């Protein structure tokens, strides 16, 4: 708000959202952390990774937990294990989920993430 450095004008912000580079895109695919994990790490939100286990809580699949298949930074979509759907020609693909609509439970640590988790701490 108060700083005059960052523009708040709508058009400009919108352009920034669409023309964002891949590193920035990786950053804004972040997810709310589940309560046990939030307690464990003292952290609100994390950038998502492939082998983690999400729970869906918005959209037509809000009963579903499951493992993440692929994340698509081009399309702003994560894909999950059993949110399968058949297409017109009788071919099964995965339903796209946007990160806000999932709450992340079990997350798989690796050294890059471990560094992030320590950095948050």
């Amino acid at each position: 708000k108060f700083n005059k450095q960052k523009s708040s004008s709508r058009r400009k912000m919108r352009k920034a959202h669409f023309t964002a580079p891949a590193g920035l895109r990786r950053k804004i695919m972040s997810s709310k952390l589940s309560k046990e994990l939030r307690l464990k790490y003292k952290t609100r939100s994390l950038p998502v990774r492939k082998d983690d286990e999400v729970l869906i809580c918005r959209g037509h699949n809000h009963g579903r937990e499951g493992k993440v298949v692929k994340i698509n930074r081009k399309r702003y979509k994560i894909y999950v294990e059993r949110v399968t759907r058949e297409k017109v020609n009788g071919e099964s693909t995965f339903i796209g989920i946007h990160p806000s609509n999932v709450v992340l439970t079990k997350l798989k640590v690796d050294k890059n993430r471990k560094k992030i988790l320590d950095r948050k701490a």
Partner: protein, 244 residues
């Protein structure tokens, strides 16, 4: 833009050519050729009077009038009926010149400020302020004018000890320092009076400013309160009165 709509070539063959005589773009081939040119009626042709950079944008409003407007606006806020009329949900308030102890100036958490407003009894008004944020119709949305809110109480303070940052960020509240009281804030949209919350220090300082027990720099120099045209406006009492 200065040249707007005139950077086509300019040509005018029309008399005896069996067309209207207004200019046409010259050359051939392309669809733009032979087509209606510059002029306040054609595709891309530029409106009849452009708007220049040099409209008379502002106005030199007069010092004595401005001062009077400030004094009168504050005075209007004083009167209970006018504030109510201005539409505040002020029904349960104890008194319209609302003055609070200078501990208000030292408040430093938003929740306490809300709590304080509720304690005063402005709960309904606080409700209207929280409620009343809406997206408004029309082109404004693309020009960074997304929400419209309605005007909340005006906090008048003598010197910061938390208030300036602390009551801000509660919808439609305004804050202003006493010495620099502002006509636009006191009288929004050309409406009169507002729900005003004064510190006791501010209240005492107000009297100093307009020259009862004057000072070297606080008091506005050479300035007096404008005297009224009518001394007493109770027309019905004059009519009622025995002599008349």
């Amino acid at each position: 833009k200065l040249g707007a709509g005139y950077e086509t070539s300019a040509e005018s063959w029309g008399t005896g050519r069996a067309v209207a005589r207004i200019p046409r773009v010259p050359g051939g081939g392309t669809h733009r050729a032979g087509q209606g040119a510059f002029g306040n009626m054609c595709r891309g042709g530029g409106m009849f009077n452009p708007t220049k950079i040099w409209r008379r944008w502002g106005r030199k409003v007069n010092l004595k009038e401005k001062r009077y407007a400030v004094c009168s606006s504050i005075a209007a806020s004083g009167v209970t009926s006018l504030v109510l009329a201005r539409g505040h949900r002020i029904s349960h308030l104890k008194e319209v010149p609302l003055v609070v102890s200078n501990d208000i100036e030292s408040l430093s958490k938003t929740k306490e400020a809300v709590n304080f407003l509720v304690s005063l009894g402005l709960k309904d008004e606080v409700n209207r302020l929280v409620k009343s944020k809406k997206i408004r119709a029309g082109k404004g949305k693309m020009r960074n004018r997304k929400y419209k809110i309605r005007n909340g109480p005006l906090i008048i303070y003598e010197n910061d000890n938390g208030v300036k940052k602390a009551f801000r960020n509660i919808p439609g509240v305004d804050l202003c320092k006493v010495t620099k009281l502002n006509l636009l804030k006191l009288a929004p949209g050309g409406s009169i009076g507002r729900l005003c919350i004064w510190s006791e220090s501010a209240f005492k300082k107000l009297d100093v400013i307009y020259g009862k027990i004057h000072e070297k720099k606080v008091t506005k120099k050479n300035y007096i309160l404008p005297k009224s045209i009518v001394h007493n406006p109770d027309i019905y009492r004059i009519i009622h009165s025995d002599k008349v």
